[PDB]
Amino acid sequence: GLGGLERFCSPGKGRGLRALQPFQVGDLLFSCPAYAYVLTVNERGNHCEYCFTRKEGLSKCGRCKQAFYCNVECQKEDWPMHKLECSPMVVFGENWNPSETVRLTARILAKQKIHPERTPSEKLLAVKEFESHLDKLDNEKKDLIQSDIAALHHFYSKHLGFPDNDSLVVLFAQVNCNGFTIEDEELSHLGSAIFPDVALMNHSCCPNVIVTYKGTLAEVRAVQEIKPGEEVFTSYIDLLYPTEDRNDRLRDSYFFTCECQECTTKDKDKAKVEIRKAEAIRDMVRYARNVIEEFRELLEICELSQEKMSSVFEDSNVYMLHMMYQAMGVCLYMQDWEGALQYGQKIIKPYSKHYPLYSLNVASMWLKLGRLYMGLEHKAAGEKALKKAIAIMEVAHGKDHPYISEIKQEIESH
Ligand SMILES: Cc1cn(CCN2CCN(c3ccccc3-c3cc(C#N)cc(C(=O)NCCCN4CCCC4)c3)CC2)c2ccccc12
Ligand SMILES: Nc1ncnc2c1ncn2[C@@H]1O[C@H](CSCC[C@H](N)C(=O)O)[C@@H](O)[C@H]1O
Ligand SMILES: [Zn+2]
Ligand SMILES: [Zn+2]
Ligand SMILES: [Zn+2]
Ligand SMILES: [Zn+2]
Calpha distance 174→196 (Å, rounded): 11
**Closest by CA position to 219, among listed 8, 406, 29:** 29
Q: Which residues pair with 20 in a beta bridge?
A: none
**Residue closest by Cα to atom 27 of ligand 1:** 236
Which one-letter DSSP state was computed for residue 138?
-
One DSSP character per residue, 207-218 reads: -SEEEEEETTEE
Residue 29: CB atoms within 10 A of its CB come to 21
* 358 annotated ligand-binding residue: no
**194: number of CA atoms within 13 Å, CB side?**
31
For residue 399, the tally of other CB atoms under 10 A from its CB is 10
Q: Assess contact for 35 and 119: CB atoms under 8 A.
A: yes
Query: Is 255's C-beta closer than 6 angstroms to any atom of ligand 2?
Result: yes
User: Of all atoms in ligand 2, which is nearest to the CA of residue 203?
Assistant: 8
| 3-state SS, one letter per residue, for 39-102 | ECHHHECCECCCCCCECCCCEECCCCCCCEECCHHHHHHHHHHHCCCHHHHHHHHHHCCCCHHH
For residue 82, say whether it is annotated as part of any ligand binding site: yes
Q: Which of 132, 110, 133 is nearest to 35 (CA)?
A: 110
C-alpha–C-alpha distance, residues 231 and 200, integer Å = 11
Q: Is 199 in the pocket of ligand 2 (CB under 6 A)?
A: yes
CB of 177 within 6 A of ligand 2: the answer is yes
Resolution for this model in angstroms, one decimal place?
1.6
What residue type is 286 in one-letter code?
A: R
CA 49 – ligand 3 centroid, Å: 7
Nearest to 276 by CA among 238, 310, 314, 306: 314
* C-alpha to C-alpha distance for 366 and 386, rounded to whole angstroms: 6
Three-state secondary structure call for residue 177: helix
Residue boundaries of the structural domains of the chain: 5-42+180-236, 43-178, 238-414
Cα separation, 172 vs 394, in Å, equals: 36
Amino acid sitting at position 272: K
Q: 232-270 burial, b if ≥16 CB within 10 A, otherwise e? A: bbbbbbbbbbbbebbbeebeeebebebebebbeeeebbe
Domains 5-42+180-236 and 238-414 share a fold: no
Adjacent-strand bridge partners of 180: 193
Alpha carbon 266 to its chain's center:
24
**β-pairing verdict for 189-194 and 36-39:** antiparallel
Under a CB-based contact definition with an 8 Å cutoff, are residues 61 and 70 in contact?
no
Helix (H, G, I), strand (E, B) or coil at 105: helix
Please give the span between the terminal C-alpha atoms of the chain, in angstroms, as a whole number.
46
* CA dihedral (314, 315, 316, 319) positive or negative: positive
In whole angstroms, what is the distance from residue 157 CA to residue 98 CA?
Answer: 13
How many angstroms separate the Cα of 257 from the Cα of each of 181, 265, 390?
22, 14, 34
| Residue 162 Cβ < 6 Å to ligand 2 | no
CA atoms of 42 and 45, how far apart (whole Å): 9
* Ligand 1 pocket check for 154: Cβ under 6 Å: no
- Of ligand 1's atoms, which has the minimum distance to the CA of residue 136? 1
Q: What H or E segment, with its residue span, contains residue 190?
A: strand 189-194
- Helix ranges, 179-317 (H): 196-199, 243-254, 261-265, 269-272, 278-295, 299-310
> How far apart, in whole angstroms, are the C-alpha atoms of residue 18 and residue 331?
44
Which residues does residue 60 pair with via DSSP β-bridges, in sequence order?
Answer: 68
- Report d(CA 106, CA 89) in Å as an integer: 14
CA distance 284 to 278: 10
CA 272 to chain CA mean position, Å: 22
Q: 387, 391, 341, 385: which is closest to 366 by C-alpha? A: 385
* Residue partners of 188: CB distance under 8 A and separation at least 6: none
Are 318 and 324 within 8 A, CB to CB?
Answer: no
126: left (phi over 0), alpha (psi -120 to 50) or beta: beta
SS3 content of the chain, % helix, strand, coil (to 5): 50, 15, 35
What atom of ligand 1 comes closest to residue 173's alpha carbon? 1
Taking the CA of residue 293 as centre, how many other CA atoms within 13 Å lie in the half-sphere pointing to its CB? 9
Structure determined by:
X-ray
Bridge partners, residue 36, by sequence: 194
- Rounded to whole angstroms, the Cα distance separating 255 from 225 reads 28
Q: What is the CATH number of domain 238-414?
A: 1.25.40.10
- Give the strand pairing for 14-19 and 5-10: antiparallel
State the Cα angle at 4 between 111 and 205, rounded to 5°: 80
**What class is the 5-42+180-236 domain?**
mainly beta
Element holding 203 (H helix, E strand): strand 202-203
Contact present, 127 and 120 (Cβ < 8 Å): no
Instruction: Using DSSP bridges, classify how beta strands 59-60 and 68-69 pair: parallel, antiparallel or unpaired.
Output: antiparallel
Whole-angstrom Cα distance, residue 106 to residue 93?
19
**51 is known to lie in a ligand binding site:** yes
**How far, in Å, CA of 203 to CA of 147, rounded?**
29
